[PDB]
Amino acid sequence: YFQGMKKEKVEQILAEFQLQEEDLKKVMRRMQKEMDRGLRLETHEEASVKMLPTYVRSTPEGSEVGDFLSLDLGGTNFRVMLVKVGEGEEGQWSVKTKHQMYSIPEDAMTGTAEMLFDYISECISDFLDKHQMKHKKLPLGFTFSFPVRHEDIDKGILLNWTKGFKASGAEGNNVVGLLRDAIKRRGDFEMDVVAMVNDTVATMISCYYEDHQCEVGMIVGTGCNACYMEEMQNVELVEGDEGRMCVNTEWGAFGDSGELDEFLLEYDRLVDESSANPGQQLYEKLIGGKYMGELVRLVLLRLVDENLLFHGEASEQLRTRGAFETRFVSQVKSDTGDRKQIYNILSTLGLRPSTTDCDIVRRACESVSTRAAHMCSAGLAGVINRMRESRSEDVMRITVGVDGSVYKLHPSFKERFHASVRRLTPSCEITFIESEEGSGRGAALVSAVACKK
Numbered sequence: 001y002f003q004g005m006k007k008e009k010v011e012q013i014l015a016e017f018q019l020q021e022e023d024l025k026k027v028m029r030r031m032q033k034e035m036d037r038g039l040r041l042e043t044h045e046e047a048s049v050k051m052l053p054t055y056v057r058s059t060p061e062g063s064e065v066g067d068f069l070s071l072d073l074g075g076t077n078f079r080v081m082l083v084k085v086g087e088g089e090e091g092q093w094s095v096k097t098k099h100q101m102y103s104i105p106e107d108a109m110t111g112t113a114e115m116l117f118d119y120i121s122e123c124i125s126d127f128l129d130k131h132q133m134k135h136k137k138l139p140l141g142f143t144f145s146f147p148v149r150h151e152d153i154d155k156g157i158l159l160n161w162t163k164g165f166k167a168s169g170a171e172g173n174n175v176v177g178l179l180r181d182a183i184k185r186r187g188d189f190e191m192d193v194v195a196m197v198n199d200t201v202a203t204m205i206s207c208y209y210e211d212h213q214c215e216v217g218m219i220v221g222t223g224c225n226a227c228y229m230e231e232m233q234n235v236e237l238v239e240g241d242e243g244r245m246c247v248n249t250e251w252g253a254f255g256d257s258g259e260l261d262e263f264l265l266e267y268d269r270l271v272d273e274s275s276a277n278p279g280q281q282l283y284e285k286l287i288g289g290k291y292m293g294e295l296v297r298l299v300l301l302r303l304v305d306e307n308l309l310f311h312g313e314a315s316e317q318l319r320t321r322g323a324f325e326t327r328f329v330s331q332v333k334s335d336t337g338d339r340k341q342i343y344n345i346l347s348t349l350g351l352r353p354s355t356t357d358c359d360i361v362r363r364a365c366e367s368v369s370t371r372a373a374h375m376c377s378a379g380l381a382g383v384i385n386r387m388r389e390s391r392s393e394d395v396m397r398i399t400v401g402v403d404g405s406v407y408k409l410h411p412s413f414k415e416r417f418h419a420s421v422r423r424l425t426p427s428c429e430i431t432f433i434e435s436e437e438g439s440g441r442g443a444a445l446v447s448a449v450a451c452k453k
Ligand SMILES: OC[C@H]1O[C@H](O)[C@H](O)[C@@H](O)[C@@H]1O
Pocket: 074, 075, 145, 146, 147, 162, 163, 198, 199, 200, 219, 221, 222, 223, 224, 225, 226, 250, 252, 284
């Protein structure tokens, strides 16, 4: 049969995306070597994986209560949230009270740091206006999801933008300062910026009240990263040898020194070469929702060239960079051969899809998505296995808090991810939980502990 012949040929093109268990162990071990290097004074500057100290400590610590503004920059949108923090019969609960999401126009994104933060300030103002509380002066917590060198919980230098951010005059500067300045320049409201955390960190924190075993935070959204509670004595960059501190791996930059060269496909190199940060964030580029749809687009385009898809004719849309969105990937079924959604997606893209085109698009989506899950699983496994060694436990029971557009909305991803992590982590009992408003709530909780002065 003809449609079978096309699918066999497709499958041989997509086999390239496979990763054997030994490929994943190789990646996992390489990741562990970079983590080791990032944690040590002598190799920290040259590590691809930076392992940044967050100054979020395991020490039970005094907390204020009340209302906090949480800002969240670094996902799809910028989010502003009122969060209530209070004491419970056990620990400290947090509850989202109000929330608004804002898109950020491309210009405010690739202009100056000042434009970007001015834009941020307008949105905050708009949200204060909506709830008539421009008069109040709140403690603000800032989830800012990019590589930051912290000197403390409320002072951090941006190391570099990732995920397509390009605002000039931001790198090397104090991010909290940029925000305070922008709010200052505006006038119509006041805020005490008291904390700044990575999204991985906020997410971990948000999950503590419900499960004291949560010591890993993971994000698979636009970007991909993880934080974990490291033995204070292994944190060579911070004085102290008791208890634990949250380390922000910034594992997205894994591969930035060649570590992944043998696994990169032409689609990967194409995506990297055309990105805002070529040569950087190579691991993230295999996984992140910012890149996943675009990888799929390049695969489809290859299949068209081989005359296996769309009768070798691609609409101008499909030939447009970024036209295949990541959400389309998540709107693609798996265990059921449903073609409805794919047919609609592809029609809107200006294509006349056959039943067979749909099935092939679904396989392309599965292939890219599945390799993302597998690659991601080697990183988390590397982390968790290392914690097991570092805590010298025969069996380690650990809870991982997860957030992000991709883990939450891609059902096939979640399942492939869990199974792969688990095969790679013998003698660890891993519980996964999806945080709810993890970024907003996590940030308020940190702000609460910071306000207590
Ligand atoms: O949003 C998930 C991740 O995306 C990018 O990797 C950012 O550099 C990192 O800080 C963030 O945690």
